[PDB]
Design a protein around this ligand. Structure first.
Ligand SMILES: *[C@@H]1O[C@H](CO)[C@@H](O[C@@H]2O[C@H](CO)[C@@H](O[C@@H]3O[C@H](CO[C@H]4O[C@H](CO[C@H]5O[C@H](CO)[C@@H](O)[C@H](O)[C@@H]5O[C@H]5O[C@H](CO)[C@@H](O)[C@H](O)[C@@H]5O)[C@@H](O)[C@H](O[C@H]5O[C@H](CO)[C@@H](O)[C@H](O)[C@@H]5O)[C@@H]4O)[C@@H](O)[C@H](O[C@H]4O[C@H](CO)[C@@H](O)[C@H](O)[C@@H]4O[C@H]4O[C@H](CO)[C@@H](O)[C@H](O)[C@@H]4O[C@H]4O[C@H](CO)[C@@H](O)[C@H](O)[C@@H]4O)[C@@H]3O)[C@H](O)[C@H]2NC(C)=O)[C@H](O)[C@H]1NC(C)=O
Ligand SMILES: *[C@@H]1O[C@H](CO)[C@@H](O[C@@H]2O[C@H](CO)[C@@H](O[C@@H]3O[C@H](CO[C@H]4O[C@H](CO)[C@@H](O)[C@H](O[C@H]5O[C@H](CO)[C@@H](O)[C@H](O)[C@@H]5O)[C@@H]4O)[C@@H](O)[C@H](O[C@H]4O[C@H](CO)[C@@H](O)[C@H](O)[C@@H]4O[C@H]4O[C@H](CO)[C@@H](O)[C@H](O)[C@@H]4O[C@H]4O[C@H](CO)[C@@H](O)[C@H](O)[C@@H]4O)[C@@H]3O)[C@H](O)[C@H]2NC(C)=O)[C@H](O)[C@H]1NC(C)=O
Ligand SMILES: *[C@@H]1O[C@H](CO)[C@@H](O[C@@H]2O[C@H](CO)[C@@H](O[C@@H]3O[C@H](CO)[C@@H](O)[C@H](O[C@H]4O[C@H](CO)[C@@H](O)[C@H](O)[C@@H]4O[C@H]4O[C@H](CO)[C@@H](O)[C@H](O)[C@@H]4O[C@H]4O[C@H](CO)[C@@H](O)[C@H](O)[C@@H]4O)[C@@H]3O)[C@H](O)[C@H]2NC(C)=O)[C@H](O)[C@H]1NC(C)=O
Ligand SMILES: OC[C@H]1O[C@@H](OC[C@H]2O[C@@H](O[C@H]3[C@H](O)[C@@H](O)[C@@H](O)O[C@@H]3CO)[C@H](O)[C@@H](O)[C@H]2O)[C@H](O)[C@@H](O)[C@H]1O
Ligand SMILES: *[C@@H]1O[C@H](CO)[C@@H](O)[C@H](O)[C@H]1NC(C)=O
Ligand SMILES: *[C@@H]1O[C@H](CO)[C@@H](O)[C@H](O)[C@H]1NC(C)=O
Ligand SMILES: *[C@@H]1O[C@H](CO)[C@@H](O)[C@H](O)[C@H]1NC(C)=O
Ligand SMILES: *[C@@H]1O[C@H](CO)[C@@H](O)[C@H](O)[C@H]1NC(C)=O
Ligand SMILES: *[C@@H]1O[C@H](CO)[C@@H](O)[C@H](O)[C@H]1NC(C)=O
Ligand SMILES: *[C@@H]1O[C@H](CO)[C@@H](O)[C@H](O)[C@H]1NC(C)=O
Ligand SMILES: [Cl-]
Length: 968
């Protein structure tokens, strides 16, 4: 429409005039703010066979102060985009402004609680608030479009603009058109795509004003019940998605912009390990192959890598981890079987252009397979090849089912297997069988075994096929040549030659076979062996793989290795692999160019041997050095009391007065004399403190108070130094009505009620019109019994300066309102030289909040990727306490003893300095009158990986400096 690089028709996108199946993964830059680790993820996605990444930008992190857009240092998108280019990954840009994303505010900054208008509407007040963010983010995105030689190919305005309520005329075409025009005005010319929350046709092509270019929708068919990871409920596998597609947007390629790749987990939930069990390899092979049955042309997995909700960036229902049970773990590892299984499907799609041109039919329980226990969805092509998606009709069935097929081919319709026996489908599995499959001029008449990849080399063609354990398979090839077994046993392989073909039956074995048929070699593998193969692009013009274009796709080699193969390139007589190893690994290379004499692995010349089939073999030795980690309990811990407010000497004259008579919040009108909503005063994040001054009459009995912090929040209350009590919190409570009994008060004396409240993050805004992101934080109601409420005069604080936030490097959400945070003592080199020596393992003996500081050195070896974790013990039922941990000033753990479930907090290299000094700052809030303490505090590691990654540069870690605007 507006450019010629990215076009489309009814079947697929075209990139530079060439069809492409977009297989993508969701990855949020703000959840992993270390540039070199961003490259790591990109390279791990490219190794799946993927060609694209989808990303959100969080507005709340980059416009914390209204009118000051800051996307610099750790929030800079440019290194993220350059890393995408370098890895060979296209991008789908999704800057919002609304992103949902289990993020604070759904991406909206807290100052939107002061906007006089419906959020996500055509109300001028809301739209004007978005203009500065969008003109900055979209101009940056504009500079990195594919039209300007960048990686960005698609843009998403808004997010799941799908349900409205409460007097909003949904869907508002004036709204979606304005949001679209914003992007275009900033120079975005690539196609716009939407992500309808269900397949409802909203803003599709043909709907007039506010229509996007490509209609997309999202789908989370297996749901979020991570507690029952083996239960696949009846009818939850979608079957009508093609039917809906043809009703809703038949002129554009079929697109699912967020397809389930994991699950969220709330405070108190079963944990993300459970989520990875639900959204595991079996889920992938059934549910993703099912999306291929609808001829999906654009497919993005939410999430491929989740990362971490550091510095309070997350929404109140979620905790620090955003692992998400995704194929790449929060600590960046790719050990989960779901990664390897996904690699098999992504590589198949990468080399199968006939998939895009075929004609999809409706699913059938007869015609193709000889039992109604199986479903077969055909995608039939007129000589470009066909594809048959086989699964159990009862999609959850764990039964083993025998069958035969009738499939139409160019050489007649054939009953398979021709040479005796039956095919098998074992439980929760799905197969993509193929017919007339083009391997660079060689025609595979059919194969029941699934294609992993194929390549044309100088010295012939190679095809890689796999099946699961215990299965019999059959293939047939258009040829005059004979079949011979060139590796492995002749036994178990049957064959038959006709005038224009050869048929070959084989049983799956753990031992690889290789057959040869003319100029085609075919690898016959079990699934588990196929897990260890990789298909990196072979660069000849440099070291980078480049994008997945037809040329560079064809110029790829096949590599059997272990943990990871990142890249390959040819330079003179050297073949250079870059790869990662988590054990001693046999490396085979198939397709070595004839000019290559030597093998290099991560720069090191490695001795190799060529076998009788031309395969290079070499071993890479794995010998991890000593990984020596400090004992955290034995550090020189320094303590300062971070609730000096409850001392009677405390002077709060510099605090903001909570004296606004009228709230700017349109969702909830005031039920107190003045606004005690934190966001009215610029305070959107971390712990909030309120101080209520009053003069006692001497008749005061009780103080009741309604505090609100979001799900799982806690609050504590003191009268001068007298602890009154705490709401210890529950996931079920986002507010709580407390009643406290006061001690006997002295008439005419002044007293101060100090209230500490955990702000868990701002709410999302999923339904347009409900304005739920405006749900306030702080004090909603109070009652000093027998006194008017104007008796109490309130002050409050959140993070120092509120929207004029101090720490421009670490962002507007990172720190909260505690004394130690306000002064900046959570940063490297605090002024702790005259503080008391005490450990958080000794802790507190009364209700209160302690702040603990210590440094520790690491000297971990270069060329090793070693995942590190902070561990807080919970071996027995604890007293109620809350902990934050800052690592060189960055908050990387929020811990609630009594709710959980997280005890293990990964912290990435770049935040941690692996060859240098590191600073821990721990806040310990004891919500109990006897105090509280940590049971244990430990640094640990998991399997070191011999890595190809370059030096991870430490992010900016500004040291402590006295802050002029502090309250002391
Ligand atoms: C270095 O990096 C590597 C990555 O490159 C990394 O390797 C990967 O490690 C992960 C673990 O982190 C692996 O994932 C697990 O795999 C388990 C094993 O099963 C898989 O493999 C077998 C094949 O096993 C043989 O071969 C291998 C390889 O040669 C050997 O190592 C084995 O020892 C074994 O050898 C025997 O057999 C050979 C021939 O077959 C013989 O030659 C040999 O002599 C031996 O006799 C396959 O059979 C499995 O397939 C079957 O099962 C799967 C999954 O159920 C089905 O989908 C499939 O259709 C088949 O039926 C399978 O591929 C898995 O058991 C394990 O699965 C569990 O965990 C995940 C969650 O992570 C769940 O999704 C899943 O549901 C399973 O959950 C159970 O277990 C968890 C506890 O962990 C419970 O929470 C849960 O409730 C559940 O328990 C219940 O069910 C169990 C049955 O499943 C039951 O036993 C329990 O008692 C209970 O009832 C998981 O997927 C991954 O495969 C590796 N990847 C690769 C490429 O190798 C390596 O570890 C790294 N190294 C280090 C040090 O870090
Ligand atoms: C890939 O990336 C992943 C994400 O980054 C990463 O996964 C995370 O890994 C960390 C570290 O391993 C996990 O934290 C640990 O979890 C342990 C508890 O979970 C286990 O318990 C269940 C019941 O047995 C298992 O079923 C469960 O399996 C599930 O989870 C797996 C997740 O990978 C999955 O593969 C499985 O399929 C399945 O779904 C799980 O294995 C927990 O025990 C552990 O705490 C101990 O270790 C810490 C140090 O690392 C200590 O600080 C801590 O105090 C604990 O040590 C104590 O207890 C041990 C067991 O008794 C003893 O061996 C220790 O000596 C020590 O003992 C002292 O304390 C005892 C009190 O209990 C006392 O009795 C003793 O006397 C003594 O005083 C830790 O929290 C984290 O949960 C994972 N996160 C996610 C999201 O999964 C994965 O590792 C990465 N992989 C690679 C290869 O890199
Ligand atoms: C240290 O170790 C200790 C000791 O073992 C750990 O303490 C345990 O921690 C558990 C987790 O916090 C805690 O269990 C919880 O107890 C509460 C009741 O007090 C209960 O509400 C919890 O169950 C719900 O919530 C979780 C998520 O937090 C869900 O996964 C679960 O399915 C339940 O969800 C239901 O309620 C939610 C609340 O709104 C709903 O959002 C959700 O949709 C669902 O609703 C259904 O039920 C409602 C009625 O409940 C109904 O109205 C609605 O219509 C739906 O039907 C969970 O059981 C243990 O109590 C606690 N044990 C002890 C002895 O103290 C501690 O966590 C550890 N610490 C760390 C850091 O690991
Ligand atoms: O990361 C969470 C993810 O949630 C997305 O909400 C998605 C979607 O969920 C549907 O619910 C599933 C349900 O869990 C299944 O049990 C079964 O019923 O299928 C349903 C889908 O039809 C909701 O019903 C649907 O409204 C929608 O909420 C969120 O949209 C996404 O941004 C992301 O946050
Ligand atoms: C919002 O706008 C209306 C428009 O009539 C105005 O009268 C009022 O001052 C504003 N209200 C709030 C709560 O901000
Ligand atoms: C396939 O599509 C529809 C919807 O599933 C089905 O009713 C019909 O029988 C099939 N189409 C034709 C032309 O037979
Ligand atoms: C098979 O692939 C070759 C390119 O290697 C192409 O020229 C040819 O047209 C293809 N044949 C079919 C039938 O698609
Ligand atoms: C309570 O605290 C305030 C200052 O926080 C102090 O001025 C006042 O004297 C204290 N009241 C009593 C009774 O000690
Ligand atoms: C406060 O005064 C009331 C009567 O007005 C009396 O009932 C109560 O006991 C008094 N003292 C308290 C609450 O300490
Ligand atoms: C607390 O009381 C307020 C005011 O009556 C009410 O709106 C709210 O529902 C109550 N909250 C809880 C958690 O019971
Ligand atoms: Cl201060």
């Amino acid at each position: 429409l507006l450019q010629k690089y990215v076009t489309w028709d009814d079947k697929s996108l075209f990139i530079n005039g060439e069809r492409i199946m977009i297989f993508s993964g969701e990855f949020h830059p703000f959840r992993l703010p270390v540039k070199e680790l961003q490259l790591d993820i990109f390279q791990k996605v490219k190794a799946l066979g993927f060609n694209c990444v989808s990303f959100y930008v969080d507005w709340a992190l980059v416009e914390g102060k209204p009118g000051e857009y800051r996307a610099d240092g750790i929030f800079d998108l440019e290194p993220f985009f350059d890393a995408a280019s370098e890895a060979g990954i296209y991008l789908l840009a999704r800057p919002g402004p609304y992103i949902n994303a289990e993020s604070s505010g759904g991406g909206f900054p807290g100052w939107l609680q002061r906007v006089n208008g419906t959020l996500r509407s055509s109300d001028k007040a809301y739209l004007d608030a978005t203009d500065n963010y969008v003109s900055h983010v979209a101009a940056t995105i504009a500079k990195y479009q594919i039209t300007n030689g960048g990686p960005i190919i698609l843009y998403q305005p808004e997010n799941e603009y799908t349900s409205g309520c409460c007097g909003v005329e949904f869907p508002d075409p004036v709204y979606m058109q304005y949001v679209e025009d914003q992007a275009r005005n900033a120079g975005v010319v690539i196609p716009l795509i939407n992500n309808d929350a269900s397949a409802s046709g909203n803003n599709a092509p043909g709907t007039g004003k506010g229509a996007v270019d490509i209609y997309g929708h999202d789908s989370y068919p297996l749901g979020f019940d991570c507690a029952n990871p083996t239960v696949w409920p009846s009818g939850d596998l979608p079957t009508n998605f093609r039917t809906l597609h043809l009703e809703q947007s038949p002129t554009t390629p079929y697109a699912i912009v967020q397809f389930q790749g994991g699950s969220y987990d709330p405070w108190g939930g079963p944990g993300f390990a459970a989520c990875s069990e639900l959204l595991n390899n079996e889920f992938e092979r059934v549910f993703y192959k099912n999306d291929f049955s609808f001829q999906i042309a654009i497919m993005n997995l939410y999430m491929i890598f989740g990362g971490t909700n550091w510095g309070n960036l997350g929404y109140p229902n979620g905790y620090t981890s955003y692992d998400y049970g995704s194929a790449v773990t929060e600590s960046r590892n790719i050990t989960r079987e779901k990664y390897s299984e996904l690699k098999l499907l992504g590589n198949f799609a990468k080399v199968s252009p006939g998939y895009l041109t075929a004609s999809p039919g409706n699913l059938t329980t007869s015609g193709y397979a000889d039992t109604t226990d199986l479903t077969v969805t055909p995608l039939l092509g007129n000589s470009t090849g066909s594809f048959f998606v086989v699964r159990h009709s009862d999609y959850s069935s764990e039964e083993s089912t025998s069958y035969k097929l009738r499939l139409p081919t160019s050489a007649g319709s054939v009953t398979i297997p021709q040479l005796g026996g039956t095919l098998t489908l074992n439980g929760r599995d799905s197969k993509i069988h193929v017919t007339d499959y083009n391997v660079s001029g060689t025609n595979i008449i059919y194969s029941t075994a699934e294609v992993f990849t194929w390549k044309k080399f100088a010295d012939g063609k190679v095809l890689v096929l796999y099946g699961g354990a215990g299965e019999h398979h059959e293939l047939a090839i258009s040829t005059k040549s004979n079949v011979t077994v060139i590796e492995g046993s002749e036994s178990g392989i049957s064959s038959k030659q006709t005038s224009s073909s050869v048929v070959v039956g084989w049983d799956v074995s753990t031992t690889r076979r290789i057959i040869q048929v003319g100029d085609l070699k075919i690898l016959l593998l079990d699934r588990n062996s196929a897990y260890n193969y990789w298909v990196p692009q072979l660069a000849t013009d440099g070291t980078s793989p480049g994008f997945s274009t037809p040329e560079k796709v064809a110029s790829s080699i096949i590599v059997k290795a272990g943990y990871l193969v990142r890249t390959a390139y040819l330079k003179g007589s050297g073949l250079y692999l870059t790869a990662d190893f988590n054990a001693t690994t046999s490396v085979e290379v198939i397709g070595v160019p004839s000019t290559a004499k030597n093998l290099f692995i991560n720069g090191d010349k490695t001795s190799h041997t060529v076998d009788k089939n031309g395969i290079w073999s070499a071993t890479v030795d794995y010998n991890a050095p000593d990984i020596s980690l400090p004992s955290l309990k034995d550090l020189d811990w320094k303590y300062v009391d971070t609730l000096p407010e409850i001392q009677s000497s405390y002077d709060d004259s510099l605090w903001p007065a909570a004296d606004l008579k009228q709230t700017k919040n349109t969702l909830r009108s005031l039920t107190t004399p003045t606004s005690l909503y934190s966001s009215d005063y610029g305070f959107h994040t971390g712990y909030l403190l309120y101080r209520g001054h009053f003069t006692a009459t001497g008749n005061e009995s009780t103080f009741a108070i309604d505090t609100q912090g979001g799900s799982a929040f806690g609050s504590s209350v003191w009268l001068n130094g007298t602890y009154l009590g705490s709401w210890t919190g529950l996931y079920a409570n986002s507010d709580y009505n407390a009643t406290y009994n006061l001690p006997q008060l002295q008439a005419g004396k002044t007293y101060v009620i100090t209230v500490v409240i955990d702000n868990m993050g701002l709410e999302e805004n999923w339904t347009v019109g409900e304005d739920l992101m405006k749900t306030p934080r702080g004090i909603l109601n109070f009652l000093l019994a027998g006194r008017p409420s104007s008796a109490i005069s309130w002050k409050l604080t959140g993070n120092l300066g509120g929207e004029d936030y101090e720490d421009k490097v670490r962002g507007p959400l990172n720190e909260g309102g505690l004394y130690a945070e306000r002064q900046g003592f959570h940063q490297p080199e605090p002024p702790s030289q005259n503080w008391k020596s005490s450990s958080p393992l000794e802790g507190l003996s009364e209700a209160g909040i302690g702040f603990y500081s210590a440094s520790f050195d690491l000297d971990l070896p270069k060329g090793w990727d070693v995942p590190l974790f902070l561990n807080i013990g919970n071996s027995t039922t604890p007293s109620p306490y809350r902990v934050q941990v800052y690592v060189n000033g960055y908050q990387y753990a929020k811990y609630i003893s009594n709710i959980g479930p997280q005890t293990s907090f990964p912290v990435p290299e770049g935040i941690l300095n692996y060859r240098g000094t590191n600073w821990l700052a721990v806040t310990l809030w004891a919500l109990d009158s006897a105090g509280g303490k940590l049971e244990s505090l430990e640094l640990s590691y998991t399997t070191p990986v011999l890595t190809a990654l370059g030096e991870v540069e430490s992010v900016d870690q500004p040291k402590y400096k006295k802050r002029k605007g502090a309250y002391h």
